[PDB]
């Protein structure tokens, strides 16, 4: 018989599953896996005490009654929802052997649903401490969120337009005019703008708990993007206006609210998860959750206890260890069932293919494949693909890592996984900028990359086509700068991709002549048209719809200022590009033959050159044109002229029919895209009728056109 809170609360044995704090039978059951721990205790804090970094109560755990196998567990009766909890593990400290146990450390449960350390973004703790004590939120015996009947949209992936967005940056600028800039609630008031922009899916950049001040104590930098996760079950409490209120519960609810609103406006949510490493870094980094529990289990280690570094961020998560596999699958299932997330994009997903040391013939068979070797059927990806729940959500993969592994088109997929098509990005960037030998590759890109995904049994929409992302040049920087300008990152301009495949369209920098500026507008529209007429899923980063510029900096991971913010005041200045992008997305939605469920066939899709039926596939070609039969548009003719020369291109001869102009990126706005909202659309068409009557169209250099076959 034992009692915890000064005699008020009772302490029972508990049960080993499910892992993490769970409200049950008038109390809370805690369970945590630790193989190397010889002793363990549960440390309970009150919020004010945690502010002071002091343990309000400490319940030791008996290795006889409070441990089943390698799972410590303890049950406590009472109303613990208003406290926070952590663990204190005693074992062997041996960095050379991979052990890091130390009783002076209180660690956060990996299964904790909210990690309460600080409340305000960028505000250190009491004394400038960027790494104050952290604790986990103890659940209530009931859920306090009304989903209002929310149901999963389950949009077919061929019908998706994806909008990569930073949660804080989306509304943190003063021009957003939102009640709470830089939070979930603040972003809720712009989902209408997203819906009118044509987007029906938002890829949130990492919203898992992370420390924005990990680069701040040394140096004076921030961690804006958040690609170093502390807790995987927990949302970022500094992205919510509540902060650490009600032990973080409010923050949780706020995230939920955002999701709900997105689904009320017909927008799916895809979370960017980073399972390939942790904020604890190498041996020199802080001990927060995993290193103090089981470092040898949760991290890849060479025989001498050194940390394998395939993520490039200090450590590598032991993704394919059975325990870590179960943990990751549980985390994804929690985000899908509890938080109603529609899909996940996996950062450096190739690290999840590398095997673990458990299969080294020393461990199995006792004596003489090794750690970090890519696998044909990795157990973790097998578990995700064939999971009852996760099997039917979006599973996008960034198929590469910092260790030199590159698996675009080859990521173990089970005919389920999608991928960030980096080859599409490279080929489109190189063709649209006027490079030799990319007409055939560009045509393959326009067809959903059949040479990558068709052989393996996947469809065109398993290819996530994108030209720009959070890392790399923005769409406007892609046509403004030839080389990166990362001196502000502080690392002597050593950061980011060195092979950008970009072109300044003549002069470099934002101060150029009128011709260069018009060419840049043309190029931005050409990139968007290529993205919106290709087979696959078009993904673009936030701000590319109005021409967001980061000043040539292609790696802004450590900047909490307007360089990474959505500029709502600059959106109005460049509303012409936003209008063109919205109209292009709507045009893609209307066309029956652009979001195809299967790869285009020669019956529907015909390839042309400057003359119909005679495409130029040679290395000198810089022109790609095609015509596609459409069940709603009749027929659409698309053409890209990436050459530096204008061309009067002949159009296919369709007796009894005429080609009616729709899109021309060279035209001045609003005539770059013709809609019925222009009172003088008919006059504009008539002014080119003398070319369209003889089946011709005059195209400028570096420009694209789209025409529709109307009866005549």
């Amino acid at each position: 018989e034992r009692y915890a809170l000064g005699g008020a609360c009772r302490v029972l044995a508990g049960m080993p599953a499910p892992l993490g704090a769970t409200a049950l039978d008038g109390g809370v059951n805690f369970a945590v896996y630790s193989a190397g721990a010889s002793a363990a205790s549960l440390c309970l804090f009150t919020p004010d005490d945690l502010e002071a970094d002091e343990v309000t109560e400490e319940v030791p755990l008996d290795p006889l009654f409070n441990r089943t196998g390698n799972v410590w567990h303890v049950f406590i009766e009472g109303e613990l929802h208003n406290m926070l909890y952590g663990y204190r593990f005693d074992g062997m400290f041996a960095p050379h052997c991979g052990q890091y146990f130390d009783v002076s450390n209180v660690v956060v449960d990996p299964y904790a649903k909210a990690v309460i350390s600080r409340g305000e973004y960028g505000v250190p703790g009491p004394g400038g401490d960027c790494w104050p004590q952290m604790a986990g939120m103890i659940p209530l015996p009931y859920s306090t969120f009304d989903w209002q009947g929310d149901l999963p949209l389950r949009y077919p992936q061929k019908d998706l337009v994806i909008y990569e967005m930073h949660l804080r940056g989306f509304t943190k600028h003063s021009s957003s005019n939102v009640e709470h800039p830089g939070t979930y609630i603040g972003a809720i008031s712009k989902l209408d703008y997203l819906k009118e922009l044509g987007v029906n899916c938002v890829e949130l950049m990492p919203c898992h708990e992370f420390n924005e001040l990990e680069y701040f104590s040394c140096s004076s930098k921030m961690n804006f993007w958040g690609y170093s996760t502390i807790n995987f079950f927990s949302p970022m409490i500094r992205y919510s206006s509540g902060g650490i209120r009600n032990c973080g519960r409010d923050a949780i609810n706020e995230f939920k609210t955002f999701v709900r609103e997105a689904h009320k406006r017909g927008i799916e949510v895809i979370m960017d998860v980073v399972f390939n490493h942790t904020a604890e870094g190498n041996e020199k980094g802080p001990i927060l959750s995993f290193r103090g529990i089981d470092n040898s289990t949760y991290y890849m280690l060479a025989p001498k206890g050194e940390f394998y570094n395939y993520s490039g961020c200090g450590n590598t998560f032991n993704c394919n260890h059975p325990v870590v596999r179960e943990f990751i699958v549980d985390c994804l299932r929690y985000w899908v069932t509890e938080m109603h997330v529609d899909g996940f994009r996996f950062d450096l997903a190739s690290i999840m293919t590398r095997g673990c040391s458990l299969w080294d013939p020393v461990n199995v068979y006792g004596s003489p494949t090794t750690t970090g070797t890519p696998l044909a059927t990795p157990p973790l990806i097998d578990m995700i693909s064939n999971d009852p729940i996760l099997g039917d959500v979006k599973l996008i993969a960034e198929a590469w890592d910092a260790g030199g592994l590159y698996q675009v088109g080859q990521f173990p997929h089970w005919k389920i996984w999608s991928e960030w098509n980096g080859k599409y990005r490279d080929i489109v960037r190189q063709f649209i900028k006027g490079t030799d030998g990319f007409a055939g590759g560009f045509a393959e890109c326009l067809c959903g990359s059949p040479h990558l995904y068709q052989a393996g049994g996947r469809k065109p929409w398993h290819s996530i086509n994108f030209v720009c992302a959070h890392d790399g040049f923005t769409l406007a920087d892609l046509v403004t700068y030839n080389k990166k300008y990362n001196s502000s990152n502080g690392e002597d301009n050593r950061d980011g991709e060195n092979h950008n495949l970009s072109w300044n369209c003549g002069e470099e920098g934002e101060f150029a002549g009128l011709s260069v500026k018009r060419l840049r507008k043309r190029q931005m529209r050409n990139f968007f048209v290529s993205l919106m007429v290709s087979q696959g899923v078009p993904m673009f980063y936030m701000g590319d719809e109005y021409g967001h510029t980061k000043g040539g900096n292609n790696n802004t991971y450590c900047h909490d200022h307007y360089v990474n913010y959505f500029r709502w005041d600059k959106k109005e200045e460049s509303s012409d590009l936003q209008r063109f992008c919205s109209l292009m997305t709507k045009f893609r939605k209307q066309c029956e033959s652009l979001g195809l469920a299967d790869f285009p066939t020669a019956q529907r899709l015909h390839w042309h050159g400057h003359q119909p039926g005679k495409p130029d596939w040679s290395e000198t070609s810089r022109f790609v044109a095609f015509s596609t039969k459409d069940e709603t548009k009749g027929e659409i003719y698309v053409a890209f002229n990436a050459s530096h020369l204008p061309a009067v291109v002949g159009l296919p001869e369709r007796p009894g029919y005429r080609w009616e102009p729709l899109v021309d990126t060279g035209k001045p706005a609003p005539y770059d895209f013709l809609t019925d909202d222009l009172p003088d659309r008919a006059h504009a068409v008539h002014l080119f009728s003398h070319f369209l009557n003889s089946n011709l169209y005059p195209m400028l250099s570096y420009s694209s056109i789209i025409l529709e076959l109307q009866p005549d």
Partner: protein, 729 residues
Amino acid sequence: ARSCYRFRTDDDGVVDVAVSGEDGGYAVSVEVPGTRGREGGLVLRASGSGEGVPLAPAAGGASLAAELSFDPTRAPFYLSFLLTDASGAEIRTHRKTSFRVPVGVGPGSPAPLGMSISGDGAVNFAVYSKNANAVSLYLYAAAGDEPALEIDLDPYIHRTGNVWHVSLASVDGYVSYAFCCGGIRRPLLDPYAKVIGDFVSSMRCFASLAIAPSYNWGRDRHPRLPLEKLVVYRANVALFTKDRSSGLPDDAAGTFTGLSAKVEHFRSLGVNAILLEPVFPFHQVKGPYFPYHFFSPMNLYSSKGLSVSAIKSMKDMVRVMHRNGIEVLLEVVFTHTAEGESECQTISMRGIDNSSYYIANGIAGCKASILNCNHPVTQKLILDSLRHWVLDFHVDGFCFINAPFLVRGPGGEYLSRPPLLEAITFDPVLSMTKIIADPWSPLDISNVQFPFPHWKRWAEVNTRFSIDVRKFLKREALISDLATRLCGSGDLFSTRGPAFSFNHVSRNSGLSLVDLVSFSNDDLLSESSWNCGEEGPSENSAVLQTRLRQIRNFLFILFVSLGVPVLNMGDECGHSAAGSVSYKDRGPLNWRGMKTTFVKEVTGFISFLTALRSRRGDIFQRREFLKLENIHWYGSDLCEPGWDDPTSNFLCMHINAEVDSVRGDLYICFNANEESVSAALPALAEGSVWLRLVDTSLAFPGFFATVQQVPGLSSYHVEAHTCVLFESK
């Protein structure tokens, strides 16, 4: 008490349908918020009937709405409707469907898989089926034949990914449930059901809606006996006590209660671990080795013949064993089931989703359905089963029958990295339970001899031990084989230790001890048995004496080798199988023989051997192989044995008791030759003399002395077909 459903329309809008039960009918409130797309008002065409209940401004005109009511006592049903604006145009979901909502059943939750009871009292059902695109729940009340209630599940509301789910206000008046998948009206058994009904052959079983009452384990604790200090005794729950000679009441014999009633018999032999044969529910035709279900014990092993009584009785038996210091080990078959390819055999998961749970077309030469053990869904099912049997029934270990099969992938290939075995080995909950790999397969397809992975954690049943010992006693093996098997079979368990070698000389299948010495014909050549001069039972006194000596030698070799001796049921009392090598021919254990002198000799010898193992734990109950300085091999007279000489069926071990309290050396002579042989005893220090503890050529009073004294360097005369054990004092 309400449930909201927020349908996304196909004209950029939302439709909220709230279903509220009445304190009896139901109220369905439809609400269209927003504007523009519905400019002019709209009407709720419920199934397109002449009705339509026009929506009237409910909230400030922004929220248009309508309210419908449905009569009480109506079974769960589906309200399907469309919306038509004030121009004739229709309005549909974003999937181009008519807004359909359930009435009488809530949405449900995807977890936990199976049947759950919520805090309110609502019963949640969840089942995984990727192949199916239409699932329905049948509820049967007390007798029923046809479902008392049928609830079809809407693929859009009652489904998260590939997990169909549905919640019910209550199940009062209902006793069982089943699932219909695809559209075929055959009920199916929930894989995750913890309580099930009685099998009925087409095949039919139903998961019970009753929840197993909380079991009071009291001060029950896992024995946690070290693997080295283990003496196993395999037993069949039915055959162990179902014979009237056991002296138990009817309906108590052949059950778990009968098993626990003989704990004194188990203790008398020095046993501290009982290895039960498969207790999963199984088809009566195929036998215990073809299970239908993986989460409860078989109801035939309960006094009342029910599954709940079975759970209670098995937990009681485990409690008794644990409080008596005896571990419980379950033989578990996770490589196949009793389900068939056809639809009549399908019961549980060959119907729900047989593409996930089973291999394509199974294997060659085997009708039994081969489980897709390494498919993640099947991995989860098996792991949940093991965790249930450990955390719920307090089981101490598992002996995985047909363990090699578990390494094969979906295509029948052999996986270099079997995921299921890795998951079992590193499961946090199961880290303290014993896991034993059993190469024997109930099927008719021998798989392969290959390096089963162990991670220095898996024990293995050593059939090679049986074969080599049988051959040596049959005079068709080199003494090197006996030397290898006596020292712990280090060739196989070099990196693990002798304790990981589960030695045996007789199994539930094959020939028993009394059948290895009596039945030896052309068909039984695979058993490496010797008839001792006359096939079948005989009266020739010399033959019977030879058979008794052979039985003693078998037990002696089993209990003096390094490893865990595994004693089959009935070996201690000459449970003859009548010359059959099939486990299905084994019968009830005849307990009367326990009062005979033959069984007296056998049980006393086994008890003496176990006591010798316990007392001299530094020799037999070791975690590591004996050093290659405290073991010596000798022949007729302290000489090099003929290792490569096939005609020499004699051998002697000298074990130096490493005194790192004093210890006495040991000297063991094995003579399978048809003729006697001299044995020169080793040299002992002054004042120490050999004690003849074991001699298998003598009568019961003197067969196993707790004693005759012999000076060092003496010369004993080992009779033909005998084993001798001396210990220096």
